[PDB]
From Swiss-Prot, chains A, B:
Species, as recorded: Sus scrofa (Pig)
Top-level taxon in the UniProt lineage: Eukaryota
Disulphide connectivity of cysteines: 6-11
Name of the protein described by the UniProt record: Insulin A chain
Gene that encodes it: INS
Curated annotation (Swiss-Prot), chains C, D:
Protein name: Insulin B chain
Residues of the full protein shown: 25 to 54 of 108
Organism: Sus scrofa (Pig)
Domain of life: Eukaryota
Amino acid sequence: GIVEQCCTSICSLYQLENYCN
Amino acid sequence: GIVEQCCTSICSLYQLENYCN
Amino acid sequence: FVNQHLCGSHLVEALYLVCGERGFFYTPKA
Amino acid sequence: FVNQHLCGSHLVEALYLVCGERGFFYTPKA
């Protein structure tokens, strides 16, 4: 989930945009 | 939508919780 | 604190605080 | 500014800034 990918480890733009509508 | 209900007019807890998962 | 005009990042912050570990969705257009 | 550890309200703020008028969903558990 987003916390594991962006909080616990380093985030990326690719990952964040996966959560845009 | 949420902007019309909470930004353009006064928000409420009822409305906000409608957008919780 | 939710009974006021909440816009932009202020609205997103209120959702964050109110919804907590449930999370939320933010859809300004639809 | 997105290539770092983003937690809690900081993560939500980044989603807000990156997704813009598209909006986003924030699901910390799932």
